[PDB]
């Protein structure tokens, strides 16, 4: 009943807060300026990028360096998402081969979902909200890097319109991970049994937490089908980038994921 679905929504929220250091809550505070913390270092060109090495973690050319930065962080995201998934009741009880497959396909969908939390039409928060890299700066990069992040901005503008909060996103993300239709699953039934349960939890959350916004649930499920198309575009631009660029190596964990994908 309602109770069991509120308890799930709560369990998932608590787990989301632990798994993800920078929530949408903190992210919005920073972007509006309503924080009592220092405004983040604005990176708008090669000069400001250079001056802003003192706030980022890179551990040879600009576009490539930015991509190595985005690559480092993107690996920490997979680890955060992986620990979150382990908290989704019954996810661990699944076939370990299924757990891998769900994550393999799910993480990019969830990375673009949670990127939108850090985005506005002008730019994206980086290095745990203490940097802000502008959209125009990322467009102005030389191709193929020129329009690598642009489709994420386009999505985030539309997605942020739904004004979802952390408690909504916690469940939305769980629903994306438990997609019983990922290529190469072995035991679909117990995946769908959990997603079914998560979708009720999500629907109830959206009624309680946005009782003026009607069929936000419907709108949100339409967006979930956009992400796939959007993630395929991304996978192929990366496919291209792997080939055309000789110098830069791709991180092992990313290679695990992207190999045998679409």
């Amino acid at each position: 009943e309602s109770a069991d679905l509120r308890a799930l929504a709560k369990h998932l929220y608590d787990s989301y807060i632990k798994s993800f250091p920078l929530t949408k809550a903190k992210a919005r505070a920073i972007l509006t300026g309503k924080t009592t913390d220092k405004s983040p270092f604005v990176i708008y060109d090669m000069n400001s990028l250079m001056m802003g090495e003192d706030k980022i973690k890179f551990k040879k050319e600009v576009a490539i360096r930015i991509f190595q930065g985005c690559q480092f962080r993107c690996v920490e995201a997979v680890q955060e998402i992986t620990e979150y998934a382990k908290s989704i009741p019954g996810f661990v009880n699944l076939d370990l081969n299924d757990q891998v497959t769900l994550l393999k396909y799910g993480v990019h969908e969830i990375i673009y979902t949670m990127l939108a939390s850090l985005m506005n039409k002008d730019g994206v928060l980086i290095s745990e909200g203490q940097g802000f890299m502008t959209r125009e700066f990322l467009k102005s990069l030389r191709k193929p890097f020129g329009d690598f992040m642009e489709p994420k901005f386009e999505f985030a503008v539309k997605f942020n319109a739904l004004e979802l909060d952390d408690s909504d996103l916690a469940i939305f993300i769980a629903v994306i991970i438990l997609s019983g239709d990922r290529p190469g699953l072995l035991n679909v039934k117990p995946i769908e049994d959990i997603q079914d349960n998560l979708l009720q939890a999500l629907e109830l959350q959206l009624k309680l937490n946005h009782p003026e916004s009607s069929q936000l649930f419907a709108k949100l499920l339409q967006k979930m089908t956009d992400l796939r198309q959007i993630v395929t575009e991304h996978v192929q631009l990366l496919q291209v980038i792997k080939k055309t660029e000789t110098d830069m190596s791709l991180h092992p964990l990313l290679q695990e994921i992207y190999k045998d994908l679409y």
Binding site: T82, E83, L96, Q99, K104, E256, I257
Partner: peptide, 11 residues
Amino acid sequence: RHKILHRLLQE
């Protein structure tokens, strides 16, 4: 065979 994903799930 997804060694790192395997380890991240196992850990």
